[PDB]
Ligand binder design. Structure first.
Ligand SMILES: O=C(NC[C@H](O)CN1CCc2ccccc2C1)c1cc(NC2COC2)ncn1
Ligand SMILES: C[S@@+](CC[C@H](N)C(=O)[O-])C[C@H]1O[C@@H](n2cnc3c(N)ncnc32)[C@H](O)[C@@H]1O
Lengths: 302, 625
């Protein structure tokens, strides 16, 4: 496409070092989306200096890499769709596009294996996908309000998290006849991130700008801090041995926190909502954030 | 045909999307006016200063299209009742913004959600918007039959779905709406868009929504069963509800994506059109009644005023009343004169309140049916109709019918009558002063004379209808008591309402009334068992009457005379709505009052709570003698 949509929604680094971009048009005549590959991270967000790009029929609420050449997309259209990257890696082609949700698909996550995925929508449902066979294996109506965020466990294929505006945080395990388990009124949970090593630890941000550290087996809320002034949009751990935590909010700021949740870095670089953050696989102190201000920023983390 | 529209939460190209849905056969479209995911900040920088444009341009559609085809939708992130203050204030501003943009566009309706218990601030902001600027827009509150919490799959191991029965808890969705509309002071601009889930709740909570201002029903595509040919259909009990809603002439909204992928989208709609084509065609009564639904008519003056020519004309077309009257005379004659006397005994018949003469012809047809001889007087107060009578008599009836142009209470009769025939009945039997009239006329009935009708009885039943409560409320006029509209009965084809208990007799009158001290004043206490939670808005009035022996007329629904449109029910409102819980008793008191000049009703509710005595002294309404 000759022009990229103003509202940048998601940014994810591939293992080879390339940069994936999801973009939505949330205003103006046409409300749609687009997907982008940037083999030059510093060339973002410039349409002229990109490796590949494609128009989607509707906006992009969430996305993720599926392995190395798959792009899993959570659409406004109420559809989950998979986009297959070219072997030349200059074209981006649709693989499946399945209208199975009844409202905007707001969140996606790929399970540890890479053959199955989980999606959360405003229709209040959560669905489990076979990416190979292009179908819905399981559909779960567990929540009572719209599902904000779903996060697949790092290493277990049957386990994931979900949180919704019904104030519930659900630990899942598709091995149990009753899959969900309620983890305990705090402000509505908005963002989820598993610990990348300790498979029993996760973090969640609320609408009040508070990031909390939870142990699953203990369920007595260990630690919390008032990181942000507004809703916590996302949480991403660094690839580090002892990992750092990137914390993005609607206060148009980024934060980096240690494992005890003390503030290390802060960046006002954005003049609109900070929408995603992705750590470089190559330089582990380099962190890339995209916003609605159409800025693509690269951060040096001490 | 049904009026129906498509719900969407994704519009890429407004022009294309509207085209696609129009081709599908949808009358209108429910779409967002700003992007649903486009959260906007109003207070703190830098997000506050986000460069525009904030949404799509109004130029993309024609004024007409905006007015007729588009229903606006409040952004789902707008949450005026959030626990977070920042979110509260932003949503406030956001709600005004969006609402104003709808008003700016001139949209006919705008959707808003009721999806939790506390909507206090949402109601405030809505209300305030209603009292700012001059606009006509309607507001549809999206509220489901079953709260989403009570539909969730039993899959949370450590927090199971309560499988026990909670009668009130299963009705919680109605209370969400009731609180909201109460806060908004029953605005005529706030209606219900009822969401219908896959599993219908118990019948009682469905009935809760009777009498409510339902403008729309929402059908998610997911609730549709599939048949052996792969087409969308609905369960027998879902069909039931659709038929009910059809009578209420609601608009249908199809929400969600196509889950029957093998066939086009219009298939869902085609099923509704199929169901609409399938309802039983209107009965004789419903052909004449149609167009009068929940329309209020003020108390008229049967004595002090004269009926117009066309009023008579319409009521003369009744397929049953006159046939019934003919039969009642027919039986009476045969009884009064034996076969051997069929030429020696001529019966003197007096039509009291003859109108344009149909009961005169009914008397003539009954004489030739019974092979008996009758002498007719036709007394009428309305000199205008007395024109028609005297023209009928000169051209047709001749000397057999004497036409008398006066009030029966005043006429001095040459001879006394065998039978006095009259039809002076109101919707509440005696509310057109039939007792008073025939009373001052029974002095010229023979000591063994029959009166037709012989007796009549009024019936009352408590009703719930926030719709009709609102109609009455809207009947406030300048230059009178600002609450007088509540202290008078209204003749109305009650339609969008809920009968809360079985009708019970109220007042009865017999004719003739040879009781020594003739008194027409009454006082009656009634107790109505109510077995559902509800809100009381008034009492429906009906009547039954005995013309002669087993020949009768009724507007009492249980025993209603077939096809008889002549009388609609009456409505006695109450000033303030009264909450009634399941198992409670509504106790009402009705007085019939009079002096020498006028006659009126007074009423009050004494249980479960007391109301003010209504129309005391006849300060708001009387019928003049
Ligand atoms: O209930 C109503 N009126 C109360 C009156 O006591 C009814 N009688 C009925 C018989 C009658 C005969 C001659 C002249 C007047 C009248 C009026 C009512 C019904 C209604 N019916 C619609 C017209 O076709 C259905 N429209 C408006 N009002
Ligand atoms: C409801 S109408 C019935 C008219 C006619 N019998 C018919 O069925 O078409 C009652 C009629 O009786 C007349 N009427 C009412 N009160 C009367 C009175 N006190 N004396 C004489 N006529 C009266 C009215 O003028 C009116 O035409």
């Amino acid at each position: 496409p000759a022009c990229m949509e103003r509202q940048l929604e998601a940014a994810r680094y591939r293992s080879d070092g390339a940069l994936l971009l999801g973009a939505s048009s949330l205003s103006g005549r046409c409300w749609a989306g687009s997907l982008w590959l940037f083999k030059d991270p510093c060339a973002a967000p410039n349409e002229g200096f990109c490796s590949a790009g494609v128009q989607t029929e509707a906006g992009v609420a969430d996305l993720t890499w599926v392995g190395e050449r798959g792009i899993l997309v959570a659409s406004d259209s109420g559809a989950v769709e998979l986009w297959e990257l070219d072997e030349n890696e200059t074209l981006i082609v649709s693989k499946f596009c399945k209208y199975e949700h009844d409202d905007i698909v707001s969140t996606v996550s790929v399970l540890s294996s890479g053959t199955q995925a989980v999606s959360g929508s405003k229709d209040i449902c959560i669905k489990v996908w076979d990416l190979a066979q292009q179908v819905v294996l399981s559909s779960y109506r567990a929540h009572a309000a719209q599902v904000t965020c779903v996060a697949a466990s790092p290493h277990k294929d049957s386990v994931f998290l979900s949180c919704s505006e019904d104030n519930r945080i659900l630990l899942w395990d598709t091995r149990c006849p009753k899959p969900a388990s309620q983890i305990g009124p705090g402000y509505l949970p908005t963002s989820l991130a598993w610990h990348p090593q300790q498979s029993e630890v996760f973090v969640f941000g609320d609408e009040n700008g508070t990031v909390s550290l939870v142990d699953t087996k203990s369920t007595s809320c260990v630690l919390s801090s008032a990181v942000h002034s507004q809703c916590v949009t996302g949480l991403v751990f660094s690839p580090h041995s002892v990992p750092f935590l990137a914390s993005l909010s609607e206060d148009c700021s980024l934060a980096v926190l240690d494992s005890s949740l003390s503030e290390l870095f802060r960046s006002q670089a954005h003049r609109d909502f900070v929408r995603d953050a992705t750590w470089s696989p190559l330089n582990h102190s380099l962190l890339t954030t995209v916003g609605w201000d159409h800025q693509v920023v690269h951060h040096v983390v001490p | 045909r049904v009026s129906s529209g498509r719900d969407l939460n994704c519009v890429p190209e407004i022009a294309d999307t509207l085209g696609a849905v129009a081709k599908q056969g949808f009358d209108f479209l429910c779409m967002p006016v700003f992007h649903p995911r486009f959260k906007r900040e109003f207070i703190q920088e830098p997000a506050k200063n986000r460069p525009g444009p904030q949404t799509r341009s109004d130029l993309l559609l024609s004024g007409r299209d905006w007015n007729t085809l588009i229903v606006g939708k409040l952004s789902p992130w707008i949450r005026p009742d959030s626990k977070v203050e920042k979110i509260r204030r932003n949503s406030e501003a956001a709600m005004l913004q969006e609402l104003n943009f709808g008003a700016y566009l001139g949209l006919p309706a705008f959707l808003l959600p009721l999806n939790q218990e506390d909507n206090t601030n949402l109601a405030r902001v809505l209300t305030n918007h209603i009292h700012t600027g001059h606009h006509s827009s309607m507001f549809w509150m999206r509220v489901p039959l079953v709260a989403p919490e009570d539909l969730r799959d039993d899959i949370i191991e450590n927090a199971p779905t309560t499988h026990t029965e909670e009668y009130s808890g299963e009705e919680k969705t109605w209370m969400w709406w009731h609180n909201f509309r109460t806060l908004c002071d029953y605005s005529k601009r706030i209606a219900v868009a009822l969401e219908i889930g896959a599993d219908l709740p118990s019948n009682h909570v469905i009935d809760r929504w009777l009498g409510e201002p339902i403008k729309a029903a929402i059908l998610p595509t997911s609730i549709f069963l599939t048949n052996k040919k792969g087409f969308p259909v609905l369960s027998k009990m879902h069909q039931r509800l659709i038929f009910r809603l059809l009578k209420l002439e609601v608009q249908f909204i199809i929400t969600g994506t196509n889950h029957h992928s093998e066939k086009e989208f219009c298939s869902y709609l085609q099923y509704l059109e199929y169901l609409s084509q399938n309802r039983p065609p209107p009965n004789a009564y419903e052909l004449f009644a149609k167009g009068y639904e929940d329309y209020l008519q003020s108390p008229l003056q049967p004595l002090m005023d004269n009926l117009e020519s066309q009023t008579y004309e319409v009521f003369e077309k009744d397929p049953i009343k006159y046939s019934q009257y003919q039969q009642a005379i027919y039986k009476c004659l045969l009884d009064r004169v034996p076969e051997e006397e069929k030429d020696t005994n001529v019966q003197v018949l007096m039509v009291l309140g003859a109108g344009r003469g149909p009961l005169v012809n009914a008397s003539l047809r009954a004489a030739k049916q019974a092979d008996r001889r009758i002498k007719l007087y036709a007394v009428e107060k309305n000199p205008n109709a007395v024109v028609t009578l005297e023209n009928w008599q000169f051209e047709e009836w001749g000397s057999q019918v004497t036409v008398v142009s006066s009030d029966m209470r005043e006429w001095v009769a040459p001879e006394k009558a065998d039978i006095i025939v009259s039809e002076l009945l109101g919707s509440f039997a005696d509310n057109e002063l039939s007792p008073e009239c025939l009373d001052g006329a029974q002095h010229f009935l023979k000591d063994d004379g029959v009166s037709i009708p012989g007796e009549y009885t009024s019936f009352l039943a408590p009703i719930s209808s926030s719709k009709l409560y609102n109609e009455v409320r809207a009947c406030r006029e300048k230059d009178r008591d600002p609450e007088a509209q509540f202290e008078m009965p209204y003749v109305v084809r009650l339609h969008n309402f809920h009968q809360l208990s079985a009708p019970q007799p109220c007042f009865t009158f017999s004719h003739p009334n040879r009781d020594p001290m003739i008194d027409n004043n009454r006082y009656c206490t009634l107790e109505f068992p109510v077995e559902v939670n509800t809100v009381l808005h008034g009492f429906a009035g009906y009547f039954e009457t005995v013309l002669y022996q087993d020949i009768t007329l009724s507007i009492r629904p249980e025993t209603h005379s077939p096809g008889m449109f002549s009388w609609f029910p009456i409505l006695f409102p109450i000033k303030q709505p009264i909450t009634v819980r399941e198992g409670q008793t509504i106790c009402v008191r009705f007085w019939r009052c009079s002096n020498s000049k006028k006659v009126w009703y007074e009423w009050a509710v004494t249980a479960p709570v007391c109301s003010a005595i209504h129309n005391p002294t006849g300060r708001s309404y009387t019928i003049g003698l």
